[PDB]
Amino acid sequence: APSRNGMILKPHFHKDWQRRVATWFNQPARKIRRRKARQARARRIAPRPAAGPIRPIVRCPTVRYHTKVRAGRGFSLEELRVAGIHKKVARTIGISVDPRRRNKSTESLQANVQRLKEYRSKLVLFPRKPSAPKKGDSSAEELKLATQLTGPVMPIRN
Amino acid sequence: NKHQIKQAVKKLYDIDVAKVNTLIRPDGEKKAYVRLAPDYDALDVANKIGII
Amino acid sequence: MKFNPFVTSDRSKNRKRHFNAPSHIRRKIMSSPLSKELRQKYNVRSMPIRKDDEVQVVRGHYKGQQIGKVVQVYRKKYVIYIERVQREKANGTTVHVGIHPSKVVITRLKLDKDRKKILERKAKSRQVGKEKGK
Amino acid sequence: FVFGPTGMPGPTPSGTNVGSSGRSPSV
Amino acid sequence: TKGTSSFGKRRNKTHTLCRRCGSKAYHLQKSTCGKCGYPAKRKRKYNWSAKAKRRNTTGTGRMRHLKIVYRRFRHGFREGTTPKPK
Amino acid sequence: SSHKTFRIKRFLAKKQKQNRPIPQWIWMKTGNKIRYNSKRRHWRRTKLGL
Amino acid sequence: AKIKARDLRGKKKEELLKQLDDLKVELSQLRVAKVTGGAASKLSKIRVVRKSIARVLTVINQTQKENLRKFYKGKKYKPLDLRPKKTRAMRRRLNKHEESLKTKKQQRKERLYPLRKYAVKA
RNA sequence: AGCCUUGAAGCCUAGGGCGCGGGCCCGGGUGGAGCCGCCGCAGGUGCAGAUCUUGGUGGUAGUAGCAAAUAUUCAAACGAGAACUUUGAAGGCCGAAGUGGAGAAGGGUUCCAUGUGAACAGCAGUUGAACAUGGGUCAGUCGGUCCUGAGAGAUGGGCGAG
């Protein structure tokens, strides 16, 4: 029975909801599991960036958000072809590649090309054969001053 | 069997056997009455093996 | 405090791992201190008590300066029986009164080919800790 | 040498019988 | 007559000891067990008896092969080896 | 009856050998609680199932 | 005399089965002493001889099994007893070579595009 | 810088008191190892009932009762002990559709011997189908085993999410 004055509130508790209750008592016990496997990964990839492959710069849909800029999934094969990076060798120097992306504009295509140049210039490459340098490979003076970068690589700032 | 018994007293004790009559006790074990050949003397083959 | 996350600070688990301990562990549990005459000789503070050792009781009704031979180690009761610590039953026969190994000090070990290994082990691991400190 | 006693079990009886023979019809 | 009188006629049994589950539930006429459905390949068990399961489960018996598989597991089921001899 | 089977004569034999009292030397043991045998059976009162 | 399993491994199959066929007669004479009534010195020897027979039959089955898995050491099919017995699902896996097998298309991808080791400047 | 084996909790108390009360503090006893005051915190937190739940105990009450089927008596023995056991002598019943002598289903050691007198055998027992010790069921011909009966039940096939 309703009281004098209040809300007409509909509680969604007409199913056997006590059976499917999900308690978060393992939330602190999984934050440590994720952090542990995040440093087992940041130790498995020794000098490679800890966050992973570099992500592109990406507008958002939906006029609610079409003025912020974001970090996409990969660099469209158009932006890789403009930057001159084979789509099957990009994934081996930590460049993200998804083929699904189109490029309708140009102000963003050139932003991601300038982004690949700014990454393929900061990239310290180690020689495939350790005891013998190669042609497209950073010289031994860098490799000794090559560290593991934390956080996202070339972070995206509005 | 009565055959295995006959042929297993004629190996452990070397005594020819007349007949064998088995029965399973309420305890569970199978008692066996072995009757020796006419010339062989039970009292004197139990004397040997110990029971007397 | 103890920081090892795998050791049990619980009470009932140590009171259960104690009483349901296997015999060879009850041998270590039934250790006993060495007398200060064998301590400055071997550099060893305690030893798992064996059968034929000479011992002297320090706590209880039978505490004194009398030394006795350990007659038997009743490791299931967590007790030992010494030569002349006993009692008279009602009828007259005598029984050995059990003493806990921790309340009794050893004055002459029964050196085997193994109690020598255990002694030189303890002494070794003790000098390694002295060099670890000094 | 202290001898011992003895012990015998038996099913536990449950009281559920109801004859309900009595009838009091009064309409 | 439906009671004490007709309780004497009980002389021929319906069930006997099942050979798969050792329970006295083998219907001699229907030739099947009421406890496990013996002639059927699959052991019968229903969720609507949460308690009848706990009386027949992998822990209730000897586990004469599982209590050793649970021990050979702590070493990846090593085989054909022995400790180094004295 | 007297027309038993083997599986039944054998099960009765087991039920005969389980029907004896605890040995008296067994509650002078150390870790002991068994005062007597409580799993006993009398042929008159309890009827062995079957 | 304490029959240890060490000095049983050099003896021969029939120099073992003669010991077995002597221990079984010592059992039969002890299971007879038990029923006729005998000294505890004899009664307590039953646990000693039942375990001496256990040691003998153990060395017999161990030498026989070693000889068997030597006879089938290099053969292809061997008795299901000598085959390595692990869990059923562990015996129904793929070999380490079938696991370590690669198609010629992936032996070419792995070759033409290896995972390069690198770093980035911060 | 609380109390405690120079005696904690608990319980008992014709002892001294406090508070309107909920309650509390002292003394004596018993007991044998833990316990409390304050400021906050938390709750499965206060019982007279619910034909409440579990356990224990009363009046009823030394009362109802120990009354279906004719019946017991004498002497002796064993024994601490005899209406009830055992022997013998009487008298009686069942009266071959039996209170006799054997089996099926069912029981499962109830069978037999010795001992015991705690519990049980609705009095008693020197006795028992009780208890404790040990024994005991022997097959070519007696049955099972075999065959089919009413009927049950695979394969083939069919159906079926299974």
Add this chain to the structure above:
RNA sequence: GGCUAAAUACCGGCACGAGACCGAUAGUCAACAAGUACCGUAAGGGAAAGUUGAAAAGAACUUUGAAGAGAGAGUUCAAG
């Protein structure tokens, strides 16, 4: 038409650690020879039951009585 780890779930299993939880009518039905004893033809139902003492030192011996039972004596800091 097909394959594919990670983030994700886990009142079963093995091995663990903990608690502002309960403390033997509570907490699991089960602290104990518990899915045991017992009931039911079956499907199933299903308990009650922890504590001598530091150590058995668990009362020798005398005595009445057939015995259970007592009266002394002794063990223990204590048989209150």
Add this chain to the structure above:
RNA sequence: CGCGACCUCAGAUCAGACGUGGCGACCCGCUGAAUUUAAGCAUAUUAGUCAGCGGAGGAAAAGAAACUAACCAGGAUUCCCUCAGUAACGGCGAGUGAACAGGGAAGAGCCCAGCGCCGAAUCCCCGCCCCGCGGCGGGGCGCGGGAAAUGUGGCGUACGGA
């Protein structure tokens, strides 16, 4: 008539393998209520839930768009916060009820048929040789046997490819 192919189909205690049953907290595929709520009740609700059946793994399932969007566009799946008690459904009563975007945990892609190109360039099996030998493989021989042209292997798959 016989002979020899091929197709279709049987028989083996033929040589060598494989399945079956258990567990079931979690997971996958189906089957599927009625208590109850609506102050009655029949659609709705309970609920695609309980029961029932089948199948697994240490995770399963899903998964690299026949997608979301309508932007200056995003870009596999799974998970959390939020969207949201919202849009919507509903005797528009009781009640039921998502997704997109956005911030995060994680982060990885690929492979066939087909269309063509290559002397089937491919695969399984037995015998012998040497090794390896306790997850049955490596290399060599066999005018040794088969599978396969009713299509095996290599290149190649929508990001185009030859």
Add this chain to the structure above:
RNA sequence: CGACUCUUAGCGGUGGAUCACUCGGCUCGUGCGUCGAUGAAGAACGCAGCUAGCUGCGAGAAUUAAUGUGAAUUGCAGGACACAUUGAUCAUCGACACUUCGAACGCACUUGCGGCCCCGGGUUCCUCCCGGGGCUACGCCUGUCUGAGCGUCGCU
């Protein structure tokens, strides 16, 4: 005075509350995350010097071998054990072994009937009889072997 009855106290009984203990539960979290025709889970029956239950095990039966440990097990006997030509007891456990029913597998479920092959007694291959071992379930895959067809053909 006496009996009986009521009340209070003392002690004594019936009963086992209270308190104090706790090798048990409940809940949370972590790591792994493994059964089976090479016979699983479960059941049955057996095994101890004295043993009923629990527990352990399977005719090698409260356990064998190996390794670690290094002197006990214990309720009583007895028995090992220079403690080093050698190892009591525990724990570990990788070697060996593991009765009958059970998916349960020769056919049935009484524990009943078989068939085949190879050994040993019987015989002297004479089949008989007895004992021992190995085989003989259903579906299904690859190949082998033997076959069916007025299926499609080719040649005699």
